Each structure stands twice: as structure tokens, then as C-alpha cells.
Scaffold this active site. Structure first.
Site, PDB file in Angstrom:
ATOM      1  N   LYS A   4     -12.909  -0.380   4.673  1.00 20.64           N
ATOM      2  CA  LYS A   4     -12.913  -1.215   3.480  1.00 20.64           C
ATOM      3  C   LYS A   4     -14.006  -2.283   3.411  1.00 20.64           C
ATOM      4  CE  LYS A   4      -9.625   1.259   1.594  1.00 20.64           C
ATOM      5  NZ  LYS A   4      -8.434   1.004   2.455  1.00 20.64           N
ATOM      6  N   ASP A  64      -1.955  -5.838   9.581  1.00 17.70           N
ATOM      7  CA  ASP A  64      -2.982  -4.907   9.136  1.00 17.70           C
ATOM      8  C   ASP A  64      -4.049  -5.758   8.440  1.00 17.70           C
ATOM      9  OD1 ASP A  64      -4.540  -3.055   7.695  1.00 17.70           O
ATOM     10  OD2 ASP A  64      -2.837  -1.702   7.421  1.00 17.70           O
ATOM     11  N   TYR A 106       0.843  -1.183   0.000  1.00 24.85           N
ATOM     12  CA  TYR A 106       0.000   0.000   0.000  1.00 24.85           C
ATOM     13  C   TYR A 106       0.886   1.243   0.000  1.00 24.85           C
ATOM     14  CZ  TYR A 106      -3.179   3.437   2.253  1.00 24.85           C
ATOM     15  OH  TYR A 106      -3.940   4.513   2.588  1.00 24.85           O
ATOM     16  N   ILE A 136      -7.178  -4.959   7.765  1.00 22.94           N
ATOM     17  CA  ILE A 136      -8.261  -4.081   7.346  1.00 22.94           C
ATOM     18  C   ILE A 136      -9.178  -4.752   6.296  1.00 22.94           C
ATOM     19  CG2 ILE A 136      -6.818  -2.952   5.574  1.00 22.94           C
ATOM     20  CD1 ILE A 136      -8.345  -0.495   5.823  1.00 22.94           C
TER      21      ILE A 136
END
Ligand SMILES: *Cc1c(COP(=O)(O)O)cnc(C)c1O
Ligand SMILES: *Cc1c(COP(=O)(O)O)cnc(C)c1O
EC number: 1.4.-.-
Lengths: 425, 421
Positions: free
Chosen positions: B264, B221, B136, B223
Site C-alpha cells: 500500500k 495491522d 477490510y 500496512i
């Protein structure tokens, strides 16, 4: 193994706070409990807002003229903020200043409270090891907000009661010199106007002296005007933006780009939980940098929508301000008079949610040890939670800050009674 | 006269879009946006629930008003009800294989905030964190801007589906030592952005053992944990600890952390709901105090605790979300192969990691930029070049599919096919 910030870089002054938590006062089952007078929160006008919410249900319903816009808000994550809200905000800020100045919505960047705005500004104006000057006494929260993660230092500009704790050319010069001695580069002066904990609006004289000093040294001037809406009595509150106008500083002045403002809806409208802070600067570079930094603390789009509806209602804003000044002045007068019935007086103030009270004559000695002594007697014997002046870095022992905007009149009266009985010996 | 901090143009595609945005009616030849990782697939489920449950958003709790109560709520520990609903939802996503202690969860204003705060808590300036490549691009700002912390890449290649390797880890650790950077941890995205794949148990064990071996932290992470719509199953790092039999007696047990957010999966990026989860009391306490600079609106915490407390809704949202996402991914993947283009086989996310190496005039990044521009200016599509995500091999691109109407997706696929000609 963690970072310095999480460990050895993450006191006597919480004594009253913890003593209160352990024995909170209660109208019914703990009438002898500790009364909280150390919390700067405004609970005076929630009825006005509740009323408006009832007559205007659409705002909080993810709606716009019988139209749902939920999906649209849920997706809104632009670091520039909801345009409608930024417009309503800038108008409200103007109205508070009696429309003497106007703010460009594009120079306004929203943050999750003034706490966030405080730190972001420091990140934008100073590198670690540099310093900012702050008039003493000041909001103890600054010691964490401005220095914890920024590596920036605070150098005090001391004020004394001799002149109502006003800023002096000599105090400024001396603070600047103390920084040079320590080899800290001064990047600016941070001021709270209206002041926490003084409860006074800054005078035009102080403002001119600050503008000229800042102009002289080539540094920044940050005016934390979070209390701008709580100036309930004269003198009039003068926003630094007004002084620029009045000192005839157009965008041709170098200083014109070194003057910034910090604001928030937590103290005047009493919405600290909603996290609405703002940064205002005339310098495009600061706006852009601060806008990118706000990504670490954006304001909820659900909240931005609710408040843009609320603040767009000029009938409500106009009336809220007037009603808020009314209720606050009434309340301050109450505390101030109950205090003198005990022989205690306060620094004459016209703004804020608290009074800077003078209790020097109660000090068994003119020392901070004597002040801690008095403070403990007040906590343990009178059962009141108040803030000792040394918490705010006051240079003279004996001053205290007591709040009045988050206590029912009946409780305020009780506290004043307890004080009177105590003073009686 | 400002700070160093107050003073990466792959935004080309982004600018062109803004300038020349595609439009169903008045700009059918405009640029179509396929570079935005946003989920617009299930807003109808949420709108429906809001309609049948008006009290939540009304500052009302059982017919009574709690406006003032919420307006005043500024505890940095968060609304208890919300933290409970959150921890339950996180468990449900993981199929209740793990449970989370609400007191080890700290809310932040988005994962963006959680990302930075964690770095502030685990590493001092001049120290470093290892991150698998490609990653990312936002990490380059989030983890280093104000923290002074450095990112050292752990390179992955297509030879093995971009999976993490013991050799890549060791090599990344060594690159850090060479630069005299002290490694404090490894940051991983599971499920992965931009890969679109869930991490394998094998990768997880190898990470756990490496992190345990080096005595560093592991930040997961997750997410995208709620967007794993196809097998293999998504394995949260919390599960692997359980499975590797790591109780609180393991040293590593306190060096494993998770980052999460509602942006998300539920598609609520504007509400700013992120979270940090750690087994280490010291990190929770430090992170809790740091969250004061980015607290979640109490109005929002209340709305979502009502929403997430409805197990009928959560259960149904997840199922419906996986359905709509798989359908959508299949669409993009097939339309892509009708153009001769294939993707890294993925089962999670809101995007596909597509292989367009064969289209490169050269196996160079200049060639990739070449292709990318042709796609932007000639095909009129905004897609992300793999080099933006620090991919080590030119030719890979990330294209999103969760925020585009099927009709538009089709249009984009058509334009691609004509161009491939
Ligand atoms: C109360 C206060 C703050 C914190 O404001 P929030 O918007 O709640 O973060 C900051 N500065 C001063 C001077 C304050 O009194
Ligand atoms: C989208 C994204 C984020 C940002 O999430 P927010 O909750 O909007 O801050 C962080 N990390 C990754 C890997 C992302 O894809």
C-alpha cells in the site's frame, strides 16, 4: 498462549545435518569436514542461465522492447497469474513431456513453490480427519506439508526392494484397508513421478494400476511431477496426463476430473529461491478454489516476468533440457560407479538428483537400530551427510539417499574415496 | 468430491466495471473505478531510481553476479540484507521513535499471507478474534477460511468518528462468551481501512489496557502506516508500549504483534512483500516455519534490499508520497462537498470514508443498496458500500483517490454533482 499448531503440534534424523553445520567440509581450510550429500539441489546448469541473462538483459530490467513496465508489474496482483508466464509454463511442461500432451493455461494455478501447491491441494481435496495414501518411501517433507495445517492424515502404501520398490495392487488395497480400519476416509493417492527418493520414473504398468485403483475407489490421483524434467535415461518418463490419453480417458470419464498434477521450477531449473510452483487440474472447481487459495502464496510478479521471458525462448528451453539431462547422467554414473568400487550398489535409476543406495550388507543387523548405527558411523567417521532410508519411511532398513547434483566432481570423488577407505574395514 | 473449503456478491460494481470500463477516448461514459485501494502516485520516483541504479535488478552485487546465490536462497529466515533494510524502513516510517529486531521479523508473501499465518499461530479452530467495525472485507476470507477461526465485531458508530470504545470492546467480548467462542485477541488496522484515520493514543491505551486486562493478544495491522499524510501523528502500537512503560517484564509485551507490507505505501502489491513482527519468540519461530508455504522471491528480496537501503530514496519517497497523497485527498474531499457530500475527517490511507446518509431514501441497508446501485448504473462510478465493510449504520461509502489521474477524479466529481441534482 498460542495455537496447537504453533506449540505442541509444530528427531533422530537431523543428526547428520547438525553435525555438518558444525563442521562443514572445505576444500582449503577443512578438508576433513563433513561433505553434504543430503541436499536435493541442482547446481549443474547455472552457466546456461547466466549466459542467457547476459545476452538478454531486458527481462530482469522491468522492460519490454525498450519499454518500462515496472509500474505495471508492481501493481499486478491478479490471483490468475501473469498470462504470458502461464503460457510459457504450460509450453515448457508440454516440451518436457515431449509434446505428447498439452496443458490449458487456465487450469494451471501458480503457487509459491511445490511446498505451497502440496498443501493447497490437500486443503482443496480433503477435510481434517480424512486421509491420503502415499507410496513408501517418500519425501519426508510431506509429513509437514500435507498434514500440519490441514488436519489431514497420511496412510502409507508400502513398497519393498523385492520388486524395485514398485507400486503393487496388493499394497494399494492393503493401504486402503488400513485407512478403513482407522476410520479415515481416503480421498486420494499422492504419488511422486519421478520419485524422490527412489530416483526412478514410474512405469506404465504402475500408472495403469493406479488409474484403475483410483477409478475403482472413486478417489483422486495427485501426481507430483516436480522431477519430470530430470529423467535423463530410459525408461521414458510417463506423465499421468499421458496415461489418461493412452487409457482413452476423455472428459466423459469420471476419473478424468480426479487426476491432478503438481509441478515446480525448483528441481529442474534449480530455482528454489524464486518460489515457482504450480497446480494443474481438469476439475474447474479445484482450479477456482486453488486459485483463491493461492492468494496466500502468490508468485512475485517480478519473477513471473523474468521467467516468462526465459521460458519463452524455445532455443533455451530445448537446449537447457538436453544439457541438463547430459550433465545429470554423467554425474549419476560417477556416483554409481564410485559407489560400486566400494562394493555398494544402487537401485537402478534414471531420474532425480540422487541415488537410492543399498547398504543393507553393512548393517550389523537387519534393524532400524542397525541402520541408525551405520548412519552415525558414516556421519562421524566417514564425515558424509547422507539420508537414512527410515527418514523417508522405507519399510526395510539399510537404504540411503545420496545426492550428486550439487557437488563439484572433485568433492564427489573425495567422498567416494572416504567411503572406500571406510568400507575397507 | 472435494473438501468443505473447496465449496458475498458486492462484486456487482466490480463486474460492471470489467464489462463496461471507462475510457478517456472510446468510452467516456464508462464506469470509473474508485473502489480499488492502490497507490499509483509515486511510481516515477521508483522508476527514476531503477534507471540510476541498474545493478540491483541485474542479479549483481558490486559488479559480480549473484544469480546462482539468489536462485538457491530458500532460507525461511529471509535474506539478511533485506530484513535489515525493512526494519530500518519501518523505523523511519515511525520517525525512528521505535526500532525493530530483524530476527523478530518474518517475511511472508503479502499481508494476506501474514494475516492468515498469524491466526494459525494464535488461535485454534472455533476460537475467535475481535475486530473493530467497519473493516477490510478481505479479513472475512483471510482470517477464517482455512483457519476455522471466527470474527466477532466490535462495533463503532459515527457518533464519535468511529473510534474504539471501552463499552464496544466489553460488549464484543461478551458477545463471544455468549456464543461460547474463546477470544484469543483483538485485530486492529492502524491506520484504518476503510476509515482513513490514524488511531488515537487514547484508543491505543484503552486497547492495550483491555487486552492486558483480558489476557489476550493485540495484532496491529499497520500496512498503511506510511500513508499518514496529515496530523494527528500516526502512533504505532510499538510506540504505545514504550510510552506506557512496558518493557519485556510486562506480560502484555509479548502479546502485541504487528503486520506490515509494501503493497500500500510503496505500491508494490505484485511483488508480494508482507511481514510479521512479534516480541514472542514462540510466534516468530512458528510463523517462520509457516512462511515456507509463502516465501518471498529471493529475486525480489534482493531488489528491495538495494532500494530500501538507499536512505536518500526512502527519506524522499515518504515525503513525496505524503505530499502527493494529501494533495489528492484534498481534491476528492473538496469535489465531494461541492456536491454537498462530506467525509469522515481523515489523515491516512488511499481513500475517504464518505457520508451519504442524507441521500438514503431510508435509513436502511436496502436503501443504501438502492443508492449504491443508482451510483453504479446512473452515475457510473464504482465505489464501496459501507455494509461491505460491516458498517453498522447505512449510508457510508469508501472511495479511493490514489489510483486515478486528476482529470478522471474531476470527471467523477462532475458526474456526481450532476446526479446530486
Ligand atoms: C524439493 C521438493 C519439494 C519442494 O519444492 P519447492 O518448489 O522448493 O517448494 C516438494 N516436493 C518434493 C517431492 C520435493 O522434492
Ligand atoms: C490491501 C490490504 C491487505 C492486503 O495486502 P497485501 O500485501 O496485498 O496482501 C491486507 N490488509 C488490509 C487492511 C489491506 O487494505
Amino acid at each position: 498462549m498460542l495455537s496447537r499448531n504453533a506449540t505442541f503440534n509444530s528427531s533422530s534424523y537431523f543428526l547428520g545435518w547438525q553435525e555438518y553445520e558444525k563442521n562443514p567440509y572445505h576444500e582449503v581450510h577443512n578438508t576433513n569436514g563433513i561433505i553434504q550429500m543430503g541436499l536435493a539441489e541442482n547446481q549443474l546448469c547455472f552457466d546456461l542461465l547466466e549466459s542467457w541473462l547476459a545476452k538478454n538483459p531486458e527481462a530482469a530490467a522491468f522492460k519490454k522492447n525498450g519499454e518500462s513496465i515496472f509500474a505495471e508489474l508492481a501493481l499486478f496482483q491478479d490471483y490468475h497469474g501473469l498470462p504470458a508466464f502461464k503460457k510459457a509454463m504450460v509450453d515448457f511442461m508440454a516440451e518436457i513431456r515431449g509434446n505428447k500432451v498439452t496443458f490449458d493455461p487456465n487450469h494451471l494455478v501458480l503457487t509459491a513453490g511445490a511446498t505451497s501447491a502440496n498443501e493447497t491441494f490437500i486443503f482443496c481435496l480433503a477435510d481434517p480427519g480424512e486421509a491420503v495414501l502415499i507410496p513408501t518411501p517418500y519425501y519426508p517433507g510431506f509429513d509437514r506439508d500435507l498434514k500440519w495445517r490441514t488436519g489431514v492424515e497420511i496412510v502409507p502404501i508400502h513398497c519393498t526392494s523385492s520388486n524395485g520398490f514398485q507400486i503393487t495392487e496388493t499394497a494399494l488395497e492393503e493401504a486402503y484397508q488400513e485407512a478403513e480400519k482407522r476410520n479415515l476416509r481416503v480421498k486420494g493417492v499422492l504419488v511422486t513421478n519421478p520419485s524422490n527418493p527412489l530416483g526412478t520414473t514410474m512405469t506404465r504398468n504402475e500408472l495403469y494400476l493406479l488409474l484403475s485403483f483410483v477409478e475403482d475407489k472413486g478417489i483422486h490421483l495427485i501426481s507430483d511431477e516436480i522431477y519430470s524434467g530430470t529423467a535423463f535415461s530410459s525408461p521414458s518418463f510417463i506423465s499421468v496426463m499421458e496415461v489418461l490419453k493412452d487409457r482413452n480417458c476423455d472428459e466423459n470419464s469420471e476419473v478424468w476430473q480426479r487426476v491432478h498434477v503438481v509441478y515446480s521450477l525448483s528441481k529442474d531449473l534449480g530455482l528454489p529461491g524464486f518460489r515457482v510452483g504450480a497446480i494443474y487440474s481438469n476439475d474447474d472447481m479445484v482450479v477456482a478454489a486453488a486459485t483463491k487459495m493461492s492468494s496466500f502464496g502468490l508468485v512475485s510478479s517480478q519473477t513471473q516476468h523474468l521467467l516468462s521471458a526465459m521460458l519463452s525462448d524455445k532455443k533455451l528451453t530445448k537446449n537447457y533440457i538436453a544439457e541438463n539431462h547430459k550433465r545429470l547422467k554423467q554425474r549419476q554414473k560417477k556416483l554409481v560407479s564410485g559407489l560400486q568400487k566400494s562394493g555398494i550398489s544402487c537401485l537402478n535409476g534414471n531420474a532425480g538428483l540422487f541415488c537410492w543406495v543399498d547398504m543393507r550388507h553393512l548393517l550389523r543387523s537387519n534393524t532400524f537400530e542397525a541402520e541408525m548405527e551405520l548412519w552415525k558411523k558414516i556421519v562421524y567417521e566417514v564425515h558424509l551427510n547422507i539420508s537414512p532410508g527410515s527418514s523417508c519411511h522405507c519399510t526395510e532398513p539399510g537404504w540411503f539417499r545420496v545426492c550428486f547434483a550439487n557437488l563439484p566432481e572433485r568433492t564427489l570423488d573425495l567422498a567416494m574415496q572416504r567411503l572406500k577407505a571406510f568400507v575397507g574395514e
